[PDB]
């Protein structure tokens, strides 16, 4: 984190999405409002966010840790939906920067219990996979463009297995 993790990301957005005129989405899922805040200005600061231009190469969606898990989770879909706009509609390579797909994951699982479900392994939603599949499968390269998904990955249990 924060190595200029973000700097890099910012930079990435810069490097390609400017260069190759693509677009970017940052869907700050479950993030610290603070961290989105920090980032915000950081983009502002970077000028990648321009406040004089809403063609700051990133559209931001944040669904910080204070919404229903699902809601925060669904900020993910939201971001997707937008990015879909830019791909298909804007014909583009949208970059979908996501932080954290994990937190999403946790969130899916979180509702499940309460959903009276039996959410499988690790407590994880049984549909963990389907959730994943369907979203991931939304991500691709259409003929219209690409949604290149750059997914920030939190290391649950410092493990990935």
């Amino acid at each position: 984190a924060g190595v200029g993790k973000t700097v890099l990301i910012m930079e990435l957005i810069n490097n390609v999405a400017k260069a190759h005129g693509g677009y970017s989405v940052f869907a700050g899922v479950g993030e610290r409002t603070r961290e989105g805040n920090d980032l915000y200005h950081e983009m502002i600061e970077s000028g990648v966010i321009n406040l004089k231009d809403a063609t700051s190469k990133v559209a931001l969606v944040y669904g910080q840790m204070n919404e229903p898990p699902g809601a925060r989770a669904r900020v993910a879909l939201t971001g997707l939906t937008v990015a879909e706009y830019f791909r298909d509609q804007e014909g583009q390579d949208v970059l979908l920067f996501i932080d954290n797909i994990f937190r999403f994951t946790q969130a899916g699982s979180e509702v499940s219990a309460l959903l009276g479900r039996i959410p499988s392994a690790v407590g994880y939603q049984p549909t963990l996979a389907t959730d994943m599949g369907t979203m991931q499968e939304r991500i691709t390269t259409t003929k219209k463009g690409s949604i290149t998904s750059v997914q920030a990955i939190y290391v649950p249990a410092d493990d990935l297995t």
Binding site: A121, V122, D159, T161
Partner: protein
């Protein structure tokens, strides 16, 4: 074992790992220095052997193990052990001096009874000439009936190689007087002895140093060895670990469901 236990394990395996590593580099540090230091020395002891080298003085007729006090981190002790037991029958004199008291292990029984002396604090700052002289000195004043002595030590050969040596000691100063050794001048059983003396240390020093070089390097190796080993295991366990780990969790959550929740 049960995951705890595994960890209990692990903990220490790492510790070990470290520890092994500690020695490894440490040994290597000692070593690192040590090899360099060998130069004048090497040469020097190699020097020591001058004379026989030339005018070779051999009779129809002691022994002395040399090593560290510390274990067989190679086959140091055992090697000499072997070959000295190999010896002991044959007649030299069965006097042994063990540099290294891990000499005094490998041979230690009637090598609680075939020694003249044995040396310790072998390392802990690599041996120096002083020592060689030291060990030389008291050696002199010894009830060797200075036959044909041997010094068996492990002459290091390279980082990865040593050779268990012997050299013979023309402790029979008279062979050292004899023969071809004649052309020699300053020939007095004085400078003779008084070279024998000097060379006893020289050689001693050297040999010893070789031994120790060997010791430090084999140890080095050993100390690596272990630490990779550790690693591997850590790998092995660690899975099994997790797996069980979560597995655990899982079950309880299982239990928690439908055992404590649905039906309890």
């Amino acid at each position: 074992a049960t995951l705890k236990d595994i960890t209990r394990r692990l903990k220490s395996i790492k510790n070990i790992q470290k520890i092994t590593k500690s020695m490894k580099m440490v040994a290597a540090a000692k070593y690192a220095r040590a090899e360099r230091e060998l130069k004048p020395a090497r040469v020097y002891g190699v020097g020591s052997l001058a004379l026989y080298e030339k005018a070779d003085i051999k009779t129809p007729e002691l022994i002395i193990g040399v090593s560290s006090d510390r274990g067989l981190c190679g086959a140091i002790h055992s090697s000499v052990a072997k070959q000295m037991k190999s010896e002991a029958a044959n007649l030299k004199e069965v006097k042994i001096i063990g540099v290294g008291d891990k000499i005094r292990s490998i041979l230690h029984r009637t090598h609680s009874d075939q020694f003249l002396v044995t040396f310790k604090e072998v390392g802990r700052r690599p041996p120096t000439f002083g020592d060689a002289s030291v060990i030389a000195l008291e050696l002199l004043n010894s009830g060797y009936e200075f036959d044909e002595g041997s010094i068996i030590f492990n002459r290091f050969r390279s980082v990865i190689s040593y050779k268990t040596e012997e050299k013979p000691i023309f402790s029979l100063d008279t062979i050292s007087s004899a023969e071809s050794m004649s052309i020699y001048d300053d020939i007095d059983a004085d400078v003779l002895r008084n070279y024998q003396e000097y060379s006893l240390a020289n050689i001693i020093y050297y040999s010893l140093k070789e031994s120790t070089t060997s010791e430090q390097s084999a140890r080095m190796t050993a100390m690596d060895n272990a630490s990779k080993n550790a690693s591997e295991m850590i790998d092995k366990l660690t899975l099994t670990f997790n797996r069980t780990r979560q597995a655990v969790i899982t079950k309880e959550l299982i239990e928690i469901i439908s055992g404590a929740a649905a039906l309890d």
